[PDB]
Design an enzyme around this catalytic site. Structure first.
Site, short mmCIF file in Angstrom:
data_model
loop_
_atom_site.label_atom_id
_atom_site.label_comp_id
_atom_site.label_asym_id
_atom_site.label_seq_id
_atom_site.Cartn_x
_atom_site.Cartn_y
_atom_site.Cartn_z
N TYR A 213 0.84 -1.22 0.00
CA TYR A 213 0.00 0.00 0.00
C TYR A 213 0.87 1.26 0.00
O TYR A 213 1.88 1.33 0.68
CB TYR A 213 -0.91 0.03 1.22
CG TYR A 213 -2.12 -0.85 1.08
CD1 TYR A 213 -2.02 -2.23 1.17
CD2 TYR A 213 -3.38 -0.29 0.81
CE1 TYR A 213 -3.15 -3.06 1.01
CE2 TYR A 213 -4.51 -1.11 0.66
CZ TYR A 213 -4.37 -2.50 0.75
OH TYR A 213 -5.48 -3.30 0.61
N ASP B 276 -16.88 2.40 -4.14
CA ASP B 276 -15.78 2.20 -3.18
C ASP B 276 -14.94 3.47 -3.04
O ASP B 276 -13.74 3.47 -3.25
CB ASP B 276 -14.96 1.01 -3.62
CG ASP B 276 -14.09 0.47 -2.51
OD1 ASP B 276 -14.42 0.68 -1.32
OD2 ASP B 276 -13.06 -0.17 -2.77
MG LIG Z 1 -12.48 -2.14 -2.15
MG LIG Z 2 -14.16 -0.25 0.49
#
Ligand SMILES: [Mg+2]
Ligand SMILES: [Mg+2]
Ligand SMILES: [Mg+2]
Ligand SMILES: [Mg+2]
Ligand SMILES: [Mg+2]
EC number: 3.6.1.1
Lengths: 273, 284
Positions: free
Chosen positions: B89, B152
């Site tokens: 990340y 999202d």
């Molecule tokens: Mg996601």
């Molecule tokens: Mg999410």
């Protein structure tokens, strides 16, 4: 069998890593053969810095048996800073033993970027094939960077020359160019430059350079170089050299019993440069 | 004060991290207030995943008090793979508590249902965070990810203790002080599951990072969905555990749920399989 012996805690001034052969310390500069297999040009690489770490660990030419230690600047531990989009070093970074850039030569074993998937460990001796080489100019010195891959890498059979790095690792050469250009800018040093407009020369070219630096080292260790000033040539495996001394192995302290010291949170920072 | 209670070794199936207040677990989903400072729009962020790590740790929706546990794929620990030129990340990654991307309606900005979890947060400051940390952040903007076809959203935020925080007030400031980060963010969320055999994701607004005002509006929406969820009034709460220890007007309030959590049993990080080191080269 090669293993490592750690003295001190990682990320401190006292930290040192020696290479052992069958439990006994040897010189990481002089005692590890350059070739694991000379006929097929398989080299032993001494790994100094794992991919994605920051601490500037190097084989120390001035200390007996040339242990890997963290570089310092006026008493302070040196860490390469994170240069966006990179995290620390972007290769497994190390050197070829039994090589020496005769000083123009940068006065150190030739540097090696190992590009395989697995993250290496400090003091690891792994076997690699050379794929190519770049010539960085850093402060008026020719600082060659050999591009290599661990022969145990799943992709190694498919990689033989520099063009294959473009196929299997697209963008890594660009990133390498960029990284070596900018990596000292956060330290207040200038941008570096490459020879050949940053082109990686091929395997054949790399082999010629590696060979030259091995021949230089042969003259160095034999005690016939012009100025071996500041280099400890103590070794424990080359019996006919002036600086052979097996007792040097036994003079090394035992493995230290200490956890990694914390690294100052400042080293987390990402620099946009 | 918020602290953590760790069960087991990191990088194992037994690993759990509960967030505690006064040395007692509370729900990481429901009991941490969205706002640290409502008037100044300072949010509490729950950190799941530190920058430059791989283990896909998240608030567990179906577990009592919603500890952070490593996600699994067909029973095996899930690690996000390294996608060149990124390492794990590239943000401190987590969520805002007391929010929910409502899975039961099509969201008008993306024409897609929500991903059934707290709204996600990309915290861009210099210091690497820790799992279970509650930090205070300012929102700077928002991106409309469609993650496997679900809404999202990703809030762009900064820790109020970051040296640069005073200079970061809206999304344009991110480009000024972190040039290239937003473009890399777009890339990262597009490609990160390709090594898992999934398709490339996409973004609404051709990946534009909308501004702070936009971000606040969407954070409100997800907070409102959560208020309905926690009151027991969602048309479908998806087996989410709504147990909480701080919301007395909810039907699932239970101060004693905290007492039932095992004590900390922290062990040293377990080793991670060397395969997770691998750098994937996707294009070029
Ligand atoms: Mg996601
Ligand atoms: Mg999410
Ligand atoms: Mg070197
Ligand atoms: Mg060099
Ligand atoms: Mg999430």
């Amino acid at each position: 069998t090669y293993t490592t012996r750690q003295i001190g805690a990682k990320n401190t001034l006292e930290y040192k890593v020696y290479i052992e052969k069958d439990g006994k310390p040897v010189s990481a500069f002089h005692d590890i053969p350059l070739y694991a297999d000379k006929e097929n040009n398989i080299f032993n690489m001494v790994v100094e810095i794992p991919r994605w770490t920051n601490a500037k660990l190097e084989i120390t030419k001035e200390e007996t048996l040339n242990p890997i230690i963290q570089d310092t600047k006026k008493g302070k531990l040196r860490f390469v800073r994170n240069c966006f989009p990179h995290h620390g070093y972007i290769h497994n970074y190390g050197a070829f033993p039994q090589t020496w850039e005769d000083p123009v030569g940068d006065n150190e074993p030739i540097d090696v970027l190992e590009i395989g998937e697995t993250i290496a460990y400090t003091g690891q001796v792994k076997q690699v094939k050379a794929l190519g080489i770049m010539a960085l100019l850093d402060e008026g010195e020719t600082d060659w960077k050999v591009i290599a891959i661990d022969i145990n890498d799943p992709l190694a059979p498919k990689l033989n020359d520099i063009e294959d790095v473009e196929k299997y690792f697209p963008g890594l050469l660009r990133a390498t160019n960029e990284w070596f250009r900018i990596y000292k800018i956060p330290d207040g040093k200038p941008e570096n430059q490459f020879a050949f407009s940053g082109e990686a020369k091929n395997k054949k070219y790399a082999l010629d350079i590696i060979k030259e630096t091995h021949d230089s080292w042969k003259q160095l260790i034999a005690g016939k170089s012009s100025d071996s000033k500041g280099i400890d040539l103590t070794n424990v495996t080359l019996p006919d050299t002036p600086t052979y001394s097996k007792a040097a192995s036994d003079a090394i302290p035992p493995a230290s019993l200490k956890a990694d010291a914390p690294i100052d949170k400042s080293i987390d920072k990402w620099f946009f440069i």
